[PDB]
Amino acid sequence: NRLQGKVAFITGAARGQGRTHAVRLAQDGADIVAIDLCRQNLDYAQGSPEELKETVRLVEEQGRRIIARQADVRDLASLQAVVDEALAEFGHIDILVSNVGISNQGEVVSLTDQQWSDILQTNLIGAWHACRAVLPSMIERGQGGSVIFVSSTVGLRGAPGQSHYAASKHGVQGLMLSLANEVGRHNIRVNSVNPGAVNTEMALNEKLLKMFLPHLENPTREDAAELFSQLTLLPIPWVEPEDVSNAVAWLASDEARYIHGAAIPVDGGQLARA
Amino acid sequence: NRLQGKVAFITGAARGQGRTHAVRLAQDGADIVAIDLCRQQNLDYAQGSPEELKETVRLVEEQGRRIIARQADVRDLASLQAVVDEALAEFGHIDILVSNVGISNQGEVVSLTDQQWSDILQTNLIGAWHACRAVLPSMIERGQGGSVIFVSSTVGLRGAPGQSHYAASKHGVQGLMLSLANEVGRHNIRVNSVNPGAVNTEMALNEKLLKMFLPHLENPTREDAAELFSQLTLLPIPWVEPEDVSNAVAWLASDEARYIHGAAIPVDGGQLARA
Amino acid sequence: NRLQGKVAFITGAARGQGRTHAVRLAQDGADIVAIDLCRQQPNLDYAQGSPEELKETVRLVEEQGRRIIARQADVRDLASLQAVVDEALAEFGHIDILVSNVGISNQGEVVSLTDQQWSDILQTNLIGAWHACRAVLPSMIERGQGGSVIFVSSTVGLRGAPGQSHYAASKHGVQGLMLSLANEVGRHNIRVNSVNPGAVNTEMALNEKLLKMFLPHLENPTREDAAELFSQLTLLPIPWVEPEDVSNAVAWLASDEARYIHGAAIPVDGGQLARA
Amino acid sequence: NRLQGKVAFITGAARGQGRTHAVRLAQDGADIVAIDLCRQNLDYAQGSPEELKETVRLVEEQGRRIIARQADVRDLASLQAVVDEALAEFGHIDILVSNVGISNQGEVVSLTDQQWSDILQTNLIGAWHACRAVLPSMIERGQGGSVIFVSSTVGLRGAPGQSHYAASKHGVQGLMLSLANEVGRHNIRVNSVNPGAVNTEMALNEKLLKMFLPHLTREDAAELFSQLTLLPIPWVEPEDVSNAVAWLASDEARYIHGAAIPVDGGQLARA
Ligand code: NA
Ligand code: NA
Ligand code: NA
Ligand code: NA
């Protein structure tokens, strides 16, 4: 197991991308600390308690140990509570996966204070909170570790109709680079993965599709494939959550021990498109 | 007279960088709408006062320009809308928006507080968006294009240990900049950032900030500051001046720069290029 | 009069972007050293600089009230450039601003490009740019007044370009040269930057052979067909920038207004690089 | 065995970075086509025919096949001859590792025409030659593939005293991005790995160290270079670069395209 004896803390783990992170790192021998708000302003399906229970089953199916808790990344104390439990049961946290957050839509002149507040609190402040909660024990344990920020192509380019979301993931990259300069010295590697279109309910939701395809009354998954296929260079409409999780699992492994300060696009060429 | 007939809306205009924006654009013919909070805040440097805003007004009127200056809070959309409405009533149009510097304070990732993150984002990122929200509808409707210049920082393009919230906030401004550039380019509204490194201002050279970089020194001086920051620049300078930032702003606003769009221009004597 | 008293050395000055740089820096009060190969190269399918076109650049600069030394020269040949610099220095005493111009291009996919295309494009665009630096810089260091080096690059110095990988490699190379040079001569108060135009209104950027690559469904593409293509690439409502626009950026970088801009690559592209 | 059934063509494979790539891919089950000029203006030990035999020995010890040939990346025909032999023997080439090239020193005013010609010819034109030689079969087979340029942190930042080397590796990035746009549609993935200081003769030789430490060993190297990394290391190992290359060629990284991955312990991110 490439991650044998490691413990990975994963946010948004009830479903989607966060679930795939837990199973994939579990596959590599990592025990898991999993949190999700487990509650449904956002126009797609989010995690539930039943879905977190499935994440648990799936990780336990791989022969691993898991602590799964309802928690709120927007709330430091809520995270510290779970970190404290993990540490009492597992002794250490070696890998932090600050997963993907939330998004909704609108133009600069049309966005609301509520939309800015929500997106920053969840996507930026929440990523910082996970860091603030986990790093003290990681620094104290003295064995190094990994902080992987699950960001986005919109952390590295503009996104019309999504300026708040792009501002938030740009902010995550600023956090990442700043963190890399603080905790490098401790052998704590800090990197981002930057997916483009991904096969999830969050990335492919009808509301978002309508913004890009305002002429269509009910845009379908086929319509989405036709839109997003033009953005990738590879013959694909989007990557899978597993492709993002594979990158995360590699960064956490000794194979990638000296990778630090990187933003790795997982996008089939979107960011390289001429 | 490169900006004759234009009106520029400038934030943090009471002193320092914002003041120099106001004076420089006025020198080129722009009339001015200037706001500042005019309150000394959680920060460890001198900030703008009402008396300093009055002096900004004297300096602009001495260039033969018109100015509307008001106390306003960029953190509060309704407060900015009130000023924009007055400006549009008096001046008819706002052609240039300069979203100026914001605020900072210090701390490592593990030691920063919620208050620090909240405050820095609210002023530096939300505040910048509020100025855009407040100003763009009239600029779009007026139909003659215009300019949005975000005054950011080298830490919107690189990390800053001990300043992760600040760097996050300025990265966020770059993200806002690039997105807006895709939304309003079509209206011939040009959107760019200027990205100063170390600048000669009370905000960039304040003692608490200097002590972060120089923790062994008991009372780091301006001369200690020169010796530190000089190592960062490639040009033989300790830092740029506020005037150098304001020149870049005034160039972007002119017809000489009419098709520059989506650009982040470092005004840093080479800091970002340093090998 | 923002450049009064300055001497600008400009490559590829016969027509197109080179001419506009000469004229625009002249307008700002700089005297001009202008070089162009002045030969129609058969490996390039667009009108290039000719002696007659250099004579008209001379006429336009003198009409602004400026002096100009205009010479046929090959940037691919170090000795050729050193001879023009030595003449410049004998007549004017100093060279303050080096404008390393846009160079040349032709088309081909990675699997289809020839050794000749690679050798040609790098010789003129990259080695040539270094030649200009190699030849002008010793005097500019010795004289101890600082100066400006301004590379005229491209959006394809900052992104990939399908069908033009040698051209995009050459301008990426120019960026690497710029940044390295920035680290060497910064201490001398010599500022080093690039300007990076997108689609610009010249024969090099809009010639029919190039358009055909981009519009393979069109038998004989026109300037209208070019406008309709390139307009989709800019965020501003224009088909391309004008070479005057590139020159205004050059002229500003050379001025005291931009005295501390160093190590920058400024896109002049109506938002092409920022497009989502 | 992540690379089972694949054939990797590796340039500069006699020693150093090149050799570790061969062995690392062989470890993942790839067969290998290895070339090196095998010949000594460069102030460090370069590959020899004896070092190529040892690369063969180490790859064979993994139970793989290898075709190892003296060839010159500066000469397209020389490369086409080796590609044609590999195709006659293996039937296909799936992975191209355009590995690391050469360097020497000089400021912009002090470099020679010969210095620029040699560095561009080996580093940039050589890299293009490899692509030119390998891609037609790779496209025609219609199975996709991987092109991995071994580049440098100096393809992404400036390098005082090394402007020609930095120009060459910036150039590699341009070729990479351009190529990514041409052959993506064929499911041919194109990326770069960008190491900083690496533990090799080329990265660490005394002539180069002198340029960086003009007031003056390995220990001298490590004390200087340690300042550049954020992690507590003096440099990466060649094995670290080879690990990145091997991951990118695997199904684990199947959709990573147009990326430049720094392998530098934080050098590019340093504030
Ligand atoms: Na596609
Ligand atoms: Na300096
Ligand atoms: Na357009
Ligand atoms: Na280090």
Numbering used by the authors:
A (entry chain C): 20 to 59, 62 to 295
B (entry chain D): 20 to 60, 62 to 295
C (entry chain A): 20 to 295
D (entry chain B): 20 to 59, 62 to 237, 241 to 295
Direct quotes from the study:
Here we present a series of TIGR03971 SDR crystal structures from several mycobacterial species which contain an insertion in the primary sequence at the NAD cofactor binding site. These crystal structures demonstrate that the inserted protein residues almost completely cover the NAD cofactor, only leaving part of the nicotinamide ring exposed to solvent.
In addition to the insertion loop which covers the adenosine portion of the cofactor, a second loop which typically contains two α-helices covers much of nicotinamide mononucleotide portion of the cofactor. In contrast, this loop is ordered in each of the mycobacterial SDR crystal structures presented here.
